[model samples]
Target: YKLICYYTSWSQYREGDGSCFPDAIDPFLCTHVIYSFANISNNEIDTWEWNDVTLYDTLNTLKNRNPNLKTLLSVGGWNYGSQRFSKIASKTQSRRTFIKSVPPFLRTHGFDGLDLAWLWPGWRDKRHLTTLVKEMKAEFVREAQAGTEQLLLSAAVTAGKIAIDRGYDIAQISRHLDFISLLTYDFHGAWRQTVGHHSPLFRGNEDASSRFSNADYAVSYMLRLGAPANKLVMGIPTFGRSYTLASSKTDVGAPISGPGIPGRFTKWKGILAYYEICDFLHGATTHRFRDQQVPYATKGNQWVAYDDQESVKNKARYLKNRQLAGAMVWALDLDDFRGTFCGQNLTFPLTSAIKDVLARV
Candidate 1:
């Protein structure tokens, strides 16, 4: 199936006005919601408090609004991932304990499935990546046998070789999960001390190395490494990265001023939200193409690496051409809201465009 849109978030903010999914839910356009990083500990698993009333309420609302929607809880992000996995995957007992807790948690929260965002299964001194996946798959099967709804097992994996080679055992992990979400952004930026595209098709300068910029390269690498093309989801960052133009030439790592970091490579902490980026495009940003696809620009010392409607359209076409499973955005909160940041009437133009593109796929 052509899975159109997905949103990510933490539990504490699942239902509030600022919650990512709540703000971005467009039943007519988007279909899936992935709640990110549900921390599981022995004591915390049962005792942890979330807005259950609001959570179920929102689920019911979405179900009523769009009966086809699917929602899942994502466990473990980069920061909270590496450490807990070893414990959870240590033995049959630990795995059993986790499996027992997860279904009840999902049932309690009104979620349909689970997405594992384990950032480090094979890296950071954790040597059991393959074994962990194998064990988790076994547990998933066991839970399925024991009467839990057939949980959709998905994972978010790193894009480049450094992460893929070190953190993921693709041949093994692929068998255990339904699909792997390849984080395809963050290829080039201010971190390298040179000016280059953050998500570029070609490395602008010879010195910059890239394995995660282009949609084709990232998805192709996974397929080359034994992942099924239909089980790979390309990741698109909803936000943009900013760089300070030092001279006439664009330097990826030059000290950028304004709202983001100056010396080191930093995310656009306060760049316009997804919707704001669209508004900025209408007034300040200029659109162009390089490396056979779309990119955007603004005058003066600032450059942003973000997707506009045109870029999203290109990406959707790319996904269709590749015959990939689907596309997923890093987040939903970044979208415009009512011409403001999360206000009504603030249509997510890129998401809307994605749905239109996927209709033919």
Candidate 2:
């Protein structure tokens, strides 16, 4: 019932067509667009970028075009690190300092929700996170009774069993949250020195050691932990993990000497923007692992595994069949937003495919 699109605040600075400003977003493409992310200062919510406030105003204005659109502000990301989260949630006073700052901050910026992306609390930090969530929800409900729509509270969570079990009191947090954005991608990457689709829909028989590494397994695991299906939003990446194959084998589990060349725009190692992947696919031989329901491309020693339009559609169908909440795209900027890099001549092809598939009954 939702397509949660994540738009990174930093993308505004990316050069050329790869850059995604608030104006570039399609109001109708996503039911919700979450800005990633805010920061913490002295245990209170803070803006990460100098112009974040202006960006917030611009992004939230999209709701005027589509009244149903819900814009949320997320705090904590992969780079934000776990120290601040741990420090802020350490005690009642510290957590209170963070909690007290929420309602006004959200209302001030025209946000409908807060997404706590702790990037996961560990064994020592798990109970503290639960406490923070409980108190935050209590504060949210209390404030809403005195005002407008009760603000939605959600968390961006991990997909692995170890982190899921260690970091969450699943039933407890699920009860308090509106939805859980399960990061079901990144199952495999160049860091492992092997070739594998980063977000395989299902585990292939060849994956003896990867029994729990696929998307389906991650979803089922979350459900098994008492997370309601409707409250689980599966994540679909708009980018790919890449590697430099060490051998001519060029198959899943093939050895990789290093990460594939970084994207011209993304400029990140071991990963490629969907648009960059498009360029790589031009001369590359592509293959769909039908069993896993994802695809990969190989050009010489350079290999990239990512979601194409076909694979994104498959994931949407998987979402509906599972009766899950909906799909959450990692970041809108990574997709071919300009329709230039990818030969398809369509903007956000992978995301459009998801929206199109989810349209069906």
Candidate 3:
């Protein structure tokens, strides 16, 4: 089973106790460590951060600590926007420019693979995304045939069925990928006017609009749409989606004034790192979302929904039972790596729970 963990380069910039450098990574914890977000420069894969080269050394060094660990460099993210990707993937020459640059970049940086994070493609350009993936996969195979390790090619894809319909030619791309990391989280968040769990394993008693907003439906939808079970990796978040309530009421669809109070550590307004969630749990009245199979905690008008140890363990069981390739943690830094923030007194409690469950399975 693959226990893929993502290490964000920007995490190194966070201050004090919240900061996570490559050294903070427990190399043994994950089977594969994916360093997030390289960029597209002149239609070729390139590092986005000023210190990305320096960071890659430290990250790749972890492999020395654990020979089994495989590292991948992810390119493009939501913040990077989609139009640029559309532009690059629009033409064969541009696509070739990007594809041909990948292998050298991976070898130079000591990465075992490349992860495409195109966020979402325009309706008319989904086939171009497929073309890019197919051509890249073809090139990777060609390089391997030339007596080198085959560079793994994967993509972080949408969970929502609607987005899936618009964002991917699931089967076509799946045939080219070593694995497809299904971003099963982010079904709901502060982007909406109502409060909902960031990721729920099952649908709740909410309205019809949210009928397809659970992880269960997304996985099944993908499987039905021709994504092989073994090539699918379910993503779990180590953070909570928070909101500022507009009234005294606190329920699944309760109105919200805006994003919740920013976490002291993560400092993001609409979200809280799992460590920040732990801090929020102090005296917060936590409850289960009935049919949804997850937890939401509330204190005053500040409400948050997140996965606890039990829920994540349950997700692991679901993935294994469904015969998925493995579980993926959205990131390593968002977890309480320090072991001091959460009361559990364990470093990477959320990640460890998934690992432990998968180990037994």
RMSD of each: 4.4, 1.1, 1.1
lDDT of each: 0.62, 0.89, 0.90
What is the TM-score (0 to 1) of candidate 1?
0.82
Candidate 1, poorest ten consecutive residues by summed lDDT: 259-268
Ranking by lDDT: 3, 2, 1
List, residue by residue over 264-286, the lDDT tens digit for candidate 1.
11123424346545544544556
**RMSD (CA, angstroms), candidate 3:** 1.1
Model 3 Cα lDDT, one tens digit per residue, 1-361: 8999998988887878988988888988999889989999988899988999999999999988898789999999977889988988989899999999999999999999999999889787899999999999999999898787899998999898888998799999999999999998888877788888869998876556758889999999999999999999999998888899998889767898899998887788988888888888988998998788899999988999888899999999999999999999987899889888888689999999999999993
**lDDT agreement of model 3 with the native:** 0.90
CA lDDT of 124 in candidate 3? 75
Per-candidate TM equals: 0.82, 0.98, 0.98
Worst 10 residues of 2 by lDDT: 189-198
